[PDB]
Amino acid sequence: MEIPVIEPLFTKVTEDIPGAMGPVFDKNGDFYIVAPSVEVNGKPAGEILRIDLKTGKKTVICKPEVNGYGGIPAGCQCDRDANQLFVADMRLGLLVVQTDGTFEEIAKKDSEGRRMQGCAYCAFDYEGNLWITAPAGEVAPADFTISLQEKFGSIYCFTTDGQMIQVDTAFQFPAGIAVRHMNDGRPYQLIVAEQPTKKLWSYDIKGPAKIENKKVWGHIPGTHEGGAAGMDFDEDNNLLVANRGSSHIEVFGPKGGQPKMRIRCPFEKPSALHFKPQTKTIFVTEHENNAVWKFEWQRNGKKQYCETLK
């Protein structure tokens, strides 16, 4: 058989967002993206922005930097118990950003005393633990490096009790990350994209920062330069995966394998994606035009941690 391919209408939401990624909705329904690639004087100066979904205007909420080193904010999730954004930053590690612009760096070292690595994507499980991919080398002031070729990318779990625990390493550019939950809400599997290898990895989640049974979960089509980037589950736990460089978003069933459907994009490099809460609308960033798009999926997205109730 061939993989069915659909061609939904993509509508441009905003543009001129360098390296646009990290689409996220906060608890008030406000929409945010990050511009990791913004530079000043040739040095990093990424931004976290709020987008008015009516006009498309941009508002810089945060231009994070620590001891003079600019951040590269790259992925976002909204907290449940407070309206604050957890932001994976490729130079600063993990941040917590408020709507007023104040931010704090969560960790310069991990639970074992190793220097933190720069982070790219993150995902809350329903227990409130934050699973994080770290494809970059060590955080500032170390020189910025990325695991495009060498296998030094890592996975972290920022637990509810405040521990930054490295749970695996030796990935080649770990990117998108998502949590597959059971019907009752228990975390079941952690899904991790390894971009250049065209693989999706899964672990069984046994508890906070406790993952086992590591194995290949899905195969990403194509031999283009690129592979799986951002990802998110729909309400049936179908996993939608930006396949950067393929002009497609892949759709996997809950159990992985090969994509059961592909979504053709009007651009080559989808980078991240995020459902709008309580809708079928998927917002998609792409690095061909540095723009944000939206399209309508077949069903609503899976509730993010920030939508759940205690």
Residue numbers in the entry: 1 to 310
Quote the original article.
Following evaluation of ∼5,300 clones, a triple mutant (VEnT1.0 A21M Y37S W244R) emerged that achieves a substantial 10-fold improvement in reaction yield (2.6% to 24.8%) under the assay conditions used for evolution (70 s irradiation at 405 nm, 0.125 mol% enzyme). Pleasingly, the increased activity observed across evolution also coincided with improved selectivity, with VEnT1.3 affording (+)-1a in >99% e.e. To gain further insights into the catalytic mechanism of VEnT1.3, crystal structures of apo-VEnT1.0 and apo-VEnT1.3 were solved at 1.5-Å and 1.8-Å resolution, respectively. The structures show that the mutations installed during evolution have resulted in a repositioning of the mTX sensitizer. Interestingly in the optimized variant, mTX adopts a similar pose to the benzophenone sensitizer of EnT1.3, with the carbonyl motif projecting into the active site pocket. Molecular docking of the product (+)-1a into apo-VEnT1.3 reveals a favourable binding pose in which the product is held in a tight active site pocket shaped by mTX173, Ser37, Met21, His287, Arg244 and Gln195. In this pose, the ligand sits in close proximity to mTX (3.2 Å) in a coplanar geometry that presumably allows for efficient energy transfer between the excited sensitizer and substrate. Ligand binding is further supported by a hydrogen bond between the quinolone carbonyl and Gln195 side chain, a similar interaction to that previously observed in an EnT1.3–product complex. Mutation of Gln195 of VEnT1.3 to Ala results in a substantial reduction in activity and selectivity, providing experimental support for the predicted ligand-binding geometry and underscoring the importance of Gln195 to VEnT1.3 photocatalysis. The mTX sensitizer probably occludes one face of the quinolone substrate to direct addition of the exocyclic alkene to the 3-si face, leading to the observed stereochemical/reaction outcome.
